């Protein structure tokens, strides 16, 4: 493609990413740096006041560590719908075979959730409830049994990912590249998927050169992070399996379990 | 950032050392696999008896063990060749000694799988410096856990080989793998990443010049570094099962130290 068309595609994706995701990285950073303060959850008593005052919707029908864990599952289900609507704006995506559309979303949403979660994280905690709350890393890491070790890998990835200093216009193309992965299992027609991904990679490459001209081989370094994502997603799955087979206090209402499947 | 002419100089340096360090290149393997040559034809091992005849021609334990022990023997040789190659990568021997060890520990296996693909097609793999060829089917029919040992290698190779890299491409790709700054336990990540930036620039220009019609081959090749990380993980878990089941079987010290942690 011609440079001018790559810029058009980049601009198209940025506008749609703004409409699909309510809390952007730009806004989240304004909150985290200190540049209406968020309510801070740093221990058991401040958690209690937070749901009493802000009323986090990932709450009400239990042990605290379980309630927090399920809260992360609730938000993840919300995010899937936001990612799904974004994918529809990627040129060519809705023209793919319907089963392949479903397959790309199924295997891609986990990598995108971790990616975008880094936008809401710093080394000390994570924004919640569209940025109205902030949950400290320490409070999370101090949850009992396997739950303490659940959130820490996310922070460790986020600290390293954020060192790249990407902005929302970079991330919108990066997220698109992840969705159009031609190596997802069960794809019926790989060729148009890889054809779209080639366009997106060209647009990401030019975007990074123009937006970060002093950041040598940022393109390559960002592609290398797709290894960190694939690796952390697999660990996540293994962590769930261990919770499912050991924690008898996890059962929800059957309808809820279905929503959260 | 480097000038184009210096990047070409580095590509030629690395290709030259790759030829000096690895006796069986992809170019040689392909000439043997393609055929049409009476002087380079391999003896083919496809079952028990042809294996028995093979030892008389190419030149008391169970078959699956003898084959398995054969692969670890060749792996130790490959580690040796890979170590000699790394010493030629500009800047590598100037790094902190512990980091030199660390880069090799985590990198040798990803490189072994990469170069093993050169010796592979969908039906089998060259052995004994290309004098032999062992079919995929024969490997997959080996008993116990050994049958499933090589098939993941074959599955990766078929996709990696579709990229159609030649030895001059692979020489830079292998160098990029070795100089990974995200290896666990590295003491000085920054000097490793400066070297890799140079290597990534050299790979980018090499791929553009040697494959001008292969759009985004650079990006596609980097995404393959993801398939490598996952295949190493499977391998390590397969070994562990064998260590705890075949208590009379032993690894080479070099291999033992690599897999520790
Ligand atoms: O607003 C967002 O964009 C947002 C996106 C992701 C999470 C979040 N997901 N998450 C997972 O575990 C996870 C992941 Cl990464 C990928 C796939 C699936 C899951 C699943 F289902 F297991 F939940 C997290 C962990 Cl472990 C620690 C911190 C955050 C997360 C998020 O949390 C906000 C939050 C809400 C309530 C209480 C505390 C924090 C917000």
UniProtKB/Swiss-Prot annotation, chain B:
Induction: (Microbial infection) Expression increases when incubated with M.tuberculosis or its lipoprotein LpqH; induction is TLR2-dependent (at protein level). GO terms for cellular component: chromatin; cytosol; intracellular membrane-bounded organelle; nucleoplasm; nucleus; receptor complex; RNA polymerase II transcription regulator complex. There is a cross-link at residue 20 (Glycyl lysine isopeptide (Lys-Gly) (interchain with G-Cter in ubiquitin)). Its main location: nucleus. Phosphorylated in basal conditions and dephosphorylated when treated with the ligand. May be dephosphorylated by PPP5C. Belongs to the nuclear hormone receptor family. NR1 subfamily. Nuclear receptor that binds peroxisome proliferators such as hypolipidemic drugs and fatty acids. Once activated by a ligand, the nuclear receptor binds to DNA specific PPAR response elements (PPRE) and modulates the transcription of its target genes, such as acyl-CoA oxidase. It therefore controls the peroxisomal beta-oxidation pathway of fatty acids. Key regulator of adipocyte differentiation and glucose homeostasis. ARF6 acts as a key regulator of the tissue-specific adipocyte P2 (aP2) enhancer. This is Peroxisome proliferator-activated receptor gamma. It comes from Homo sapiens. The gene is PPARG. The chain holds residues 235 to 503 of 505 of the full protein.
